Design a binder for this molecule. Sequence first.
Ligand code: MG
Ligand code: ZN
Ligand code: ZN
Ligand code: ZN
Lengths: 75, 43, 50, 72, 1345
Amino acid sequence: ARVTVQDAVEKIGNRFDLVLVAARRARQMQVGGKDPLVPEENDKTTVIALREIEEGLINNQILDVRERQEQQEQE
Amino acid sequence: SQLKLLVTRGKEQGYLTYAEVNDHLPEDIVDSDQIEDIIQMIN
Amino acid sequence: ETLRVDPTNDRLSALVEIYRMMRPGEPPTREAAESLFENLFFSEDRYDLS
Amino acid sequence: SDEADEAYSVTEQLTMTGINRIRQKINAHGIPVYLCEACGNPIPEARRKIFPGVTLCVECQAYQERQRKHYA
Amino acid sequence: EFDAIKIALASPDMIRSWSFGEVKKPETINYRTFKPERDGLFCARIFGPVKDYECLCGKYKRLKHRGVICEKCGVEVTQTKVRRERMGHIELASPTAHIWFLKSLPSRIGLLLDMPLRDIERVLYFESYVVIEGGMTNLERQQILTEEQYLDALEEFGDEFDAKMGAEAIQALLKSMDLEQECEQLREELNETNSETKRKKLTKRIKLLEAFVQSGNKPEWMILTVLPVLPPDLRPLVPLDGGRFATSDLNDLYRRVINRNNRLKRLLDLAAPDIIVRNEKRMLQEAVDALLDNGRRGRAITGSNKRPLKSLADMIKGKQGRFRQNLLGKRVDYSGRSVITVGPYLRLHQCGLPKKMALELFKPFIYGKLELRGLATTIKAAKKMVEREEAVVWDILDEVIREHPVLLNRAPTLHRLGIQAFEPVLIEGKAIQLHPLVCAAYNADFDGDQMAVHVPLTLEAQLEARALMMSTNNILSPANGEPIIVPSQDVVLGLYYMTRDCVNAKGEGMVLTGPKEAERLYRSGLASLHARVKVRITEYEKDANGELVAKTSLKDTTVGRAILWMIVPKGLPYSIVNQALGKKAISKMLNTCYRILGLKPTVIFADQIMYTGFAYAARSGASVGIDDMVIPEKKHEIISEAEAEVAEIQEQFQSGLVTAGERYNKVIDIWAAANDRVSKAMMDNLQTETVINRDGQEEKQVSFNSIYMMADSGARGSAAQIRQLAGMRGLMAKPDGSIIETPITANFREGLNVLQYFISTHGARKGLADTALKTANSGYLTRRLVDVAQDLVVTEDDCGTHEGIMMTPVIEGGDVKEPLRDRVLGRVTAEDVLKPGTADILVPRNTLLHEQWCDLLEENSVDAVKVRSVVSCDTDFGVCAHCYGRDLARGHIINKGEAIGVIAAQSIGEPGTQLTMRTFHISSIQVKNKGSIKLSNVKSVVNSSGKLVITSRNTELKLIDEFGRTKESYKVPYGAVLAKGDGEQVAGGETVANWDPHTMPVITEVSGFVRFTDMIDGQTITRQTDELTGLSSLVVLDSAERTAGGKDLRPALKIVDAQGNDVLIPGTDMPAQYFLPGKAIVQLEDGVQISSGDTLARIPQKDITGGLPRVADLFEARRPKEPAILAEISGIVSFGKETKGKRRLVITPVDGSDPYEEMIPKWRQLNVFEGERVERGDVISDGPEAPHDILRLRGVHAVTRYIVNEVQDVYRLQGVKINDKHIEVIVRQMLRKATIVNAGSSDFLEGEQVEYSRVKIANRELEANGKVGATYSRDLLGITKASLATESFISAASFQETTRVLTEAAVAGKRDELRGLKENVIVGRLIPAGTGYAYHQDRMRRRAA
Ligand SMILES: [Mg+2]
Ligand SMILES: [Zn+2]
Ligand SMILES: [Zn+2]
Ligand SMILES: [Zn+2]
């Protein structure tokens, strides 16, 4: 589990931007199709997306550019 | 009229009790219904 | 002081002001006023200090 | 906590402020008058010795006490 | 989906377009076969089918006939949900006024036509007639006639005149009336005429007309020509057990309207006798008004079972209505409830959730996970498996539960820490195990309390329990940064027993090589928990740039403090654990752990502290016995002395030396002194009584009394409660404050006989009953402050202003009560603050003053810091992120989207629960320390005597040492005889000034002869004979008893030279004479000298409220009854006509409107002279200041400082702490209203009260233009009137009188753009405050693309 989200806050600043960015990524993984960027420790999607935000490899700009890349290659 | 002093009295005190309302009414107001309606006005 | 503010002076005016208080509108009189007072608290028909 | 456990603080404030106002009613300092401020008579040595700084004779005090008893 | 909620009247064509069919018969259903009768109040032809996809007869039942309208009974085959949205309409054969628009007070019908209310209701019930454009003959438009007047009118004026009666006449009146024509006539009457209040009401009517034109409403829609009936499934008639149906009263009311309407149709088509027809129309009108709002015109009808039938208006309004009780708070699925127990083994983020309570809350997730893992073929097999509790369901449930938080919520959620998210732990039992540390947050003990559990279902909702509402993220209270993870009662006593010392215990004085060896010594049984000892401990310090420099040394500590040191995280010092560790010290240790090491180390420290406290409290075996209440043996002789003094007083009363009340007071004083004596004796016997031997004779230390340990550690107890157990119970009190004189001289250890116990039950039951209300009316202040201050949200990172508050310590009386580090901590400064010699650019403008900058501030001893406040923020419809500062709890800086308004209300209202529910009342300066003199309003003269005297009025003197900080503040009177004067740095043991309340001096400017000019006795002065000194005195008096000949004339004392010339006042050419009002005895003579401010005229001769009512009144912004009038304008003062209750007080400005004057209530003790130049924003008579006064005079910061200081006074009186950000937010909502002084280029009315933000933006964008803005004047309202004015009528109908709000909205045709927290919640959308704030911003960007 994850006791504190203090580290994930600094990566994104706002505590509400963090929730909205992590719910987005965790729903990408949940429904669906996308995979975690981090070795999942038998976690749920919520703490997985939080832990990925902790490591700086998930955020609004990264998720949006990942949107754009697949929007391109969907064609 | 006298009810004017009653309204300003209630505004001074911040309330109005049934005693003062029974006092300050128009004396020949024999109608309990308009009594109820005038207290409902002042309230 | 309460006499100096008493607008009444004699008994029958007392009764008539009590009458105008109790059942307003009705023109009061000697007989009806004395009857109202003597049947307010002083008649076993109506009052009862048990 | 329980209803008997804040009720204590209520009662405590109550008796505390009561005793406070009452023992403030007493006078401990000294400004020896030697004569009442209502009837002019000399406040005797005994009464002025019980309460230092007493400001009224016995009977003027009783009168004012009664008057304030009616809250007027 | 949908943008704002539009509102207006309803055209009869619009009401006919809503309906799906007329309602002609008053039939609900058949009595044998309960199918809808017709064409009645329940109809399948109008209101859809009564069964799903099924015609009424039965001819059409398959889904294939979907949508068909059956040929036989015309029942459209469709869903039975359709029976819950279709509306009907009753066609009133006669019109019928809308009671909302005839009793709205003002009557909208009435005030539109400008026909007074009784005239309207006299034409309504056919009492009279009203002409309607009665031709070119005699009459007015709205001229009401009596019956016979109209009869004689029809004779002499036959036609070319039409006067109607009843609601038909009002309909014709509103219809014929043209709004723009009358609006023009109102323009002419408003600008061609000047009669102020008449034009106020005139312009109100004018605004109403312009609103009725701006909207699409037509005035003739206020008369119901067509009545729509609610869909049946909202007013249902349901079969109960036994065949006895159950109906909502709306069926009764619709039936009574429909019968009367049909009877009116009947009578109209009979040519009936028109008096009967009048009665039918009147009864139908009364029925429609009972239907629309019962009990609004007459008496509620009736009901059938002797109780007032509720109507549609009752369905909306009322505490038990629809806007409130299922619209704002509703029942909720996925939720449970259970008795909470403790379970101290939990980590701070998790809570035990019963297996049985968890298998019901997660049944959807469990069904999904079963069907997913293939353990069950389908949802039905899954349901069966869960229903029989198969062996695998507990593994499936442990997997569902793992990262899934649940919301735990106690009943009175006073503050937001009452709904906290925990991670569940599937526990065996039926009771939630709640972590001990959280119970201070919940305010919850385990005497049977219960809690509700909810499951945050969706992804975005179950990352908010993880990121916002989780138990570990919330360790700081939002009302003040202090951590609310305080260990409470077993933990502080475990830690007190651990970290203490004994004079000689096992293994005293043996050097230990670290905490590990201390623990191994204790566990081995070779050294006690408190044995003084030396241990080599290595502590770290991260004052380096993130690096922890270590340091090891032989501390002289005990084995307890040693063992406790292993628990502390890295970067804390050893002095944090090397005291005896009470409760205060125990939570200060946590506050330092936070303020050094952030959140995660503190979160681990919390449960480590808790586990080790419980462990060593259990190790201690700290029980309590009846021998632990050692009564002092000096109690008996103290009580004998007290009874002796009381007998002395009784004899002195029987002797005639004291009144009865005086004997009562002296007896109570004796018994109170005796009680304090006995309590001090018992405490002196308790605290130190432990006497031990160290290498010989003896020694006392802090006692190990179990009860004393509880009292001293801070776990439980005080001196008062231990005193009642050991000393005496002192004097009881009757409920009304009447202190009983017979004192309970016993404690509970020894007995209490019958009389003392019965005496004590009085105050006992008073306290109990008082907390029976304070629980019932629990959160009324938070409710009232979440109404006024709800929709504030931090919506901008910076407004970029330069305005703030000059925050300083509250240095009142002696030493400060609240330093600068308390009140400037967490707020961003308004301006760069330099050192006193300025020395540098110390603190930049927009730096958040956290702990480091407060260190910087009170190294340099900075005394005043300007810090940005939220009441000055230049944001629009919100508050900048910087004009709010640092946010507590989370403790970094408020991020835009914080709902700071709800938080401010909850932080003023949860602490307020700890306050008293009742409102209760309560020569030479003894200056304290060494320091320098500080003058405010420096105008002093040194007399010939050498000492100083204040020739100014409000000279304030401060003792300010060499620190730069102010250390003492004092208000000096008008010219006290100051032993020390100006700037004179002195030390303690030296009084700063002598004075006398029998001495208010009228000291002059220069020295000289005091001649008497403008003085003739018998008209203004009084003959005070000097029987005391042997002279004559002419004392200054007013016109109270002297006649009016020279009554206004003032007795002038001419201060002149020895030659006779008028010595001027140095500074102004008006000579040094004084006009004296009364209360100043004059002991001079005419032609007599005085020194440089000698004694010319000498004037002979702290209660604070504290109840929560003293906060509801502080915020409600009312007017005191002794209102200290202030100085409205600068310049000089004149006194005029007297003896009226308003004596003229003229204020002649320097260069302004010189004839300015006001009134003075001459019962008051006027405390300012007439020659002194009045300063604007200054007091004249002395008494309580009014808030509106300060707001108009000194500025918004003046009113905010006053309100903040008063609320902080009442909060610090009870020791309850709350930050000032919250009260500044409540104030910022309080003074939200501007007023238009000058219309200017602006486009508001002349004296119109407008939203200050509106005028702000308008005149600001004009200031960007070339046109002059409007000169506003800021108002100041009470919370229950600052909430009354709200933009959105949804929220306003929520917390106000609903009928008034909806009537105003209907006439005005307001459009409610849902942009408030309280409106969106009602319409089911995201509140535009927190997580949904970005969504609402994206919505605002989509709109106006
Ligand atoms: Mg409880
Ligand atoms: Zn006397
Ligand atoms: Zn059919
Ligand atoms: Zn701002």
